[PDB]
Amino acid sequence: MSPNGNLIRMLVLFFLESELHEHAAYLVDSLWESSQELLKDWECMTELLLEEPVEEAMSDRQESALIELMVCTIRQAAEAHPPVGRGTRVLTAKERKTQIDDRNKLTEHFIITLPMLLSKYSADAEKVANLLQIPQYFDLEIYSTGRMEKHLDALLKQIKFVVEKHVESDVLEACSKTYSILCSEEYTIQNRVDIARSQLIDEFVDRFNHSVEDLLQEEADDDDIYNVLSTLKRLTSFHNAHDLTKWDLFGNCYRLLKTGIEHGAMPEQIVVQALQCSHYSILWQLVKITDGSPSKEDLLVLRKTVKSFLAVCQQCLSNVNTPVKEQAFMLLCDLLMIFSHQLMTGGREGLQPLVFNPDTGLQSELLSFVMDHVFIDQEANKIEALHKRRNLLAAFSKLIIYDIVDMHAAADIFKHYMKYYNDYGDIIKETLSKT
């Protein structure tokens, strides 16, 4: 109890203080055989985190490590398998019984205590994004069973306060995914969560629409920019996993982008998010059309939308801010792939009107960005910026393979940048072999 408390406290210390475990998941996984009993004392963990001291209080860094360790243990108990990259899969009857009981214990426990945890740590973006990894492991049927509706309300309350207080893509994304999980995985509670969700969306769609109108009718206050950006981030975040097409967000994202192109002066992060939000609106318009039985005008309306947006992402390659150029680029390669001829596969040849072959102008510009932003002359940030330029190349690589761009003009650029490997590589290879 206070014994298990000492062990968990020293465990958080050994993790933080040694460089002997870099990943919490890996430490937990390694101690799992020997210390499963300790590592699932979740009452002890939430107590440490929620109670005030008498004494010796936890530091902010230890609080954070304890949450990350707690969530790793919740995953291991619920999944009953090592974490990704310690895998090698069949459970014994006793492991299956322990998995069921463990899921039951953590579900009953964290349904009650996750609201209290979110409440206390509501400001700390890292901690909240960690704490919201938890409900994905819930046995959601218990929200009915244990007459625990009071605690579902409690969570939705605290998710609302979190979404309202924050703009970090991590946090917003954890809220978005957590609403997804609560909704479409149990009918009893679906109806209640849908209401809390759509109410939350309405409040943000109002704030966004009022902020857009402020910004555009204006010379523009720093408040006008914060208001648009902050509300748009929430809606973009959610628009990935929630179909928000009933709110015409595309229209206002389009105006934000059309204004910034025209008067040249839209803040980079408003352009980037407006781009992402518009893209997510289109993907969702497309899903509703594939699955429905769409009329001729239904298709031709989505066509006009996609053409004006391809045109916006085209013009956005010429914006000064490289984050914009990269977003515009990534969406161009996505969209030109999606609205290729592939679309007409699976007897779906009704969709011909939605196909788009990029013109030469666009292919040339999708060639330039590669030359300018994938192939550049010149710690942690640089291995992250490399994998991104890899994604940007791979994304572009797909348009080459299917001849959506000039597949020859592209290979020439690959010759030009590989030259020093085809001219001196053999000599460099054998030399480095013998050292």
Ligand X SMILES: Cc1ccc(CN2CCS(=O)(=O)CC2)cc1
Tell me if 216 contacts ligand X by CB under 6 A: no
Considering the complex, what minimum distance in angstroms separates the CB of residue 259 from ligand X? 7
Q: Which residue has the tokens 């959506």?
A: 404
What token pair was written down for 266? Answer: 């839209």
Q: Which is nearer to ligand X, 85 or 264 (CB)?
A: 264
Minimum Å distance from CB 293 to ligand X? 37
Nearer to ligand X, 289 or 324 (CB): 324
Q: Three-state SS for 140?
A: coil
Q: Which residue has tokens 């004494």?
A: 55
Residue 127 or 279 with smaller CB distance to ligand X: 279
Residue among 261, 338, 344, 367 that touches ligand X (CB under 6 A): 261
- Cβ-based neighbours of 395, under 8 Å, separated by 6 or more: 329, 330, 333, 334
Task: Please report how close the Cβ of residue 226 comes to ligand X at its closest, in angstroms.
Answer: 18
Residue in 154, 266, 277, 302 binding ligand X, rule: CB under 6 A: 266
Tokens 């009915």 found at? 144
Q: Which residue, 260 or 358, has its beta carbon nearer to ligand X?
A: 260
Q: How far is the CB of 265 from ligand X (least distance, A)?
A: 7
Closest CB 331 distance from ligand X, rounded Å: 13
In the complex, minimum distance from the CB of residue 231 to ligand X, in angstroms, rounded to a whole number: 18
Applying CB under 6 A, the span of 71-79, 260-268, 276-284, 362-370 interacting with ligand X comes to: 260-268
240 interacts with ligand X by CB under 6 A: no
Within residues 375-434, the interface with ligand X by CB under 6 A covers none
Q: Do residues 250 and 282 make contact, with C-beta atoms less than 8 angstroms apart?
A: yes
In the complex, what is the shortest distance from the CB of residue 393 to ligand X, in angstroms, rounded to a whole number?
23
Contacts of 166 (CB under 8 A, 6+ apart): 125, 128, 172
As given in the structure block, the two tokens for residue 201 are 């969306």
> Which residues precede chain breaks (C–N over 2.5 Å) in the chain?
54, 88, 218, 378
Smallest gap, in angstroms, from Cβ of residue 77 to ligand X?
48
Q: Which is nearer to ligand X, 136 or 315 (CB)?
A: 315
| Closer to ligand X by Cβ: residue 262 or 349 | 262
For 294, left (φ over 0), alpha (ψ -120 to 50), or beta?
beta
Closer to ligand X at the Cβ: 158 or 319? 319
**Residue number closest to ligand X, CB atom:** 260
Give the Cβ contact number of residue 298 at 10 Å. 15
Report the distance separating Cα 356 and Cα 367, nearest Å. Answer: 18
**Position 271 contacts ligand X (CB under 6 A):** yes
Per-position DSSP letters for 304-315, written without gaps between them: HHHHHHHHHHHH
Nearest to 175 by CA among 231, 219, 238, 243: 238
Quick note: the x/- pattern for ligand X over 291-330, rule CB under 6 A, is ------------------------xx-xx-----------
List all residues 6 or more positions away from 167 whose beta carbon is below 8 Å from its beta carbon: 229, 230, 233, 234
DSSP state of 85: T
Of 72 and 275, the one with the shorter C-beta distance to ligand X is 275
* Sign, CA torsion 288/289/293/299: positive
Name the amino acid, one letter, at 52.
Answer: E
Size of the site for ligand X (CB under 6 A): 10
Residues making contact with ligand X (CB under 6 A): 257, 260-261, 264, 266, 271, 315-316, 318-319
